[PDB]
């Protein structure tokens, strides 16, 4: 696939985060947006503050991050910026609930977050399946998500990027499986089922964090909550992020129009007027339920739901002309 230069990872090793960001990075609403140059360095900081300064060989970690950066395409939304936004939200989740998770879970989850959309071409699973893309022949279900995990393993299996080699054989297999489940849970189709099972478990009082299956379900919803966190930022950031998401949807719809196929309104560039209504529906059907369930299981996660509710109110104000 694609490897980083020696210049790149060496510069990353030298990086020190400014003290004003130290405070701000702990906050859920933190926008990485204005600090592009610092993004690989922000990740290292997060790994170190969550797992410790010596739980990963600095050299190997820097080569990994830099190769991960390289294997993210320059698509409008599913890019390197998205990888770091998702990893930051996970960092904020882990920090506010530190001892609920194991050291192996904290490790794998931050890496799974940075790799979850690895080598995204800007096309949905529906597209790949309907136009019989080689990737759909390889992976029948959760097409992109199984490919993103394949890329993650392939970056690990690269010369001096294998950040986990120093773990036990038992521990290496576990973390690689935590990562597999985490990246697969990021397939939004799987979320709806998972969210309903967790909601029942919470209501009946049967949710037990010591139960592996229950644990894997909670991690899954954390993955979805991190993947959607752009809906959790200040209204001007959230509004701009939706422009990138729709730029990608419209580009996919344009490829269907070129084949004579009419795209769904969401992927139609001619149907922009329907976007505020589409966002309201997504917040009501997907985002609000996700953050609601996450707050019930993990009460410290509450500011995510609070900001989501604020952005929903903003979309209502766009619909009602305010
Ligand atoms: C009608 O609006 C939407 C429809 C939709 F299907 C997905 C999304 C969406 N609106 N905001 C979103 C979506 C996503 C997302 C999540 C996981 N995989 C792919 C994407 C694009 N992230 N964010 C912040
Ligand atoms: Mg994805
Ligand atoms: Zn994603």
Swiss-Prot record:
The entry marks the following residues as binding 3',5'-cyclic GMP, namely 78, 279
Per UniProt, 3',5'-cyclic AMP binds at 78, 279
The organism's superkingdom is given as Eukaryota
Q: Which residues of this protein are catalytic?
A: 78 (proton donor)
Q: Where does a divalent metal cation 1 bind?
A: 82, 116-117, 227
Q: What are the binding positions for a divalent metal cation 2 in this chain?
A: 117
Q: Where is the PDEase domain?
A: 5-322
Q: Where in the cell is it found?
A: Cytoplasm, Cytosol
Tissue expression remark: Abundant in the putamen and caudate nucleus regions of brain and testis, moderately expressed in the thyroid gland, pituitary gland, thalamus and cerebellum.
Its domain comment says: The tandem GAF domains bind cAMP, and regulate enzyme activity. The binding of cAMP stimulates enzyme activity. Composed of a C-terminal catalytic domain containing two divalent metal sites and an N-terminal regulatory domain which contains one cyclic nucleotide-binding region.
- Hey, which family's this protein in? Belongs to the cyclic nucleotide phosphodiesterase family.
Query: How is the quaternary structure described?
Result: Homodimer.
Q: Which disease is it linked to?
A: Dyskinesia, limb and orofacial, infantile-onset: An autosomal recessive, early-onset hyperkinetic movement disorder characterized by axial hypotonia, dyskinesia of the limbs and trunk, orofacial dyskinesia, drooling, and dysarthria. The severity of the hyperkinesis is variable. Striatal degeneration, autosomal dominant 2: An autosomal dominant disorder characterized by striatal degeneration and dysfunction of basal ganglia, resulting in hyperkinesis.
This molecule's function is given as:
Plays a role in signal transduction by regulating the intracellular concentration of cyclic nucleotides. Can hydrolyze both cAMP and cGMP, but has higher affinity for cAMP and is more efficient with cAMP as substrate. May play a critical role in regulating cAMP and cGMP levels in the striatum, a region of the brain that contributes to the control of movement and cognition.
Q: This chain belongs to which protein, by name?
A: cAMP and cAMP-inhibited cGMP 3',5'-cyclic phosphodiesterase 10A
Provide the species name.
Homo sapiens (Human)
